[PDB]
Amino acid sequence: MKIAIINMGNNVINFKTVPSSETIYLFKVISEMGLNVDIISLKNGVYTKSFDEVDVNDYDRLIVVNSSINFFGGKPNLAILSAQKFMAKYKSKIYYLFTDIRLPFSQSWPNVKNRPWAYLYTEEELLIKSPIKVISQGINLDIAKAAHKKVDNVIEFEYFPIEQYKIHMNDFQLSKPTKKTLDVIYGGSFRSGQRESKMVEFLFDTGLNIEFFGNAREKQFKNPKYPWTKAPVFTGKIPMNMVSEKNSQAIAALIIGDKNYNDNFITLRVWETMASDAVMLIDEEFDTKHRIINDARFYVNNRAELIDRVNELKHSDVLRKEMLSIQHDILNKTRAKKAEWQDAFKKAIDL
DNA sequence: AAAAAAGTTTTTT
DNA sequence: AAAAAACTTTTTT
């Protein structure tokens, strides 16, 4: 049983980029469940083999991490092209890891055939014909199916909480008490404005000391529907493997998601925050049944409630510590079911 | 020192 | 087979 895992649209080298990091983390957690897996990318490296030096059909399972396939500038992007050529050459079922609602599987050929550089490829080389099974991080498969309505060979859909790999890694550990320098923190990208209203609601004009780290920049928040006066402090992006340490610098860390994530997706940040030294504060709309933690104190409905909750946490170190203890225990409750999680993954990739 | 000019890297869906 | 920003390094006030 030989497994190959690839990222469909980003080069994989180290933990300096999120797409690379997630692909390596996946390679690691799969390896840790006793499976023989190789990451195949553009070049050989510490964690990878090169597309041009391996035969994709020597593998029994091909796993693909979702990605955008947009050709910015209308120029060729080898990460996308080489990955899809690799997929197209494969003659068995492809397992597409759908961790981001914005990144459903899509074919590059239709968007390559009319380019001035189309001559560099052929339909046979890029058009992926093998059956594809979508492994949805979201429990609502109708939403996952809707996102893949325009791709005929996607014949199977199955839910699997892919994002739990963060807590099941062999080197995992909870963050320790950390000196606080912020009231609230949130790390992420702008996501092309898909979550602008929520970001403005909970991170802007709060009167609190808030930091927004990651790709996002203040000048990206210009939608007239969600005005603001005082923005949080924006700092640069950091490596994925340093995120929990960053979250720990704050009293609390925010959990919000895209509309389609509500009561559907449990995201990496849920685990990165829950395991950190920052109290996890979740937008009620994101988890209305409180399935993450059955304690109302971890949920906020709007800006005012967030401000009040944070004020309460700043005022009572006892409450802060009590809540951290609670979220840490809940996290460990899920870590306890690691074997179950591993078995469900194997079943998802037909093993 | 501080501002402008050059050069380089990253982001954009 | 781009353009706009963001981020650095060098040259001028």
Ligand SMILES: O=c1ccn([C@@H]2O[C@H](COP(=O)(O)OP(=O)(O)O)[C@@H](O)[C@H]2O)c(=O)[nH]1
């Ligand atoms: O500087 C940063 C900011 C974010 N992240 C990662 O990016 C994820 C969030 O991605 P996104 O902005 O798409 O938000 P999501 O949809 O996952 O909530 C976080 O959980 C981290 O794993 C990171 O590695 N470095």
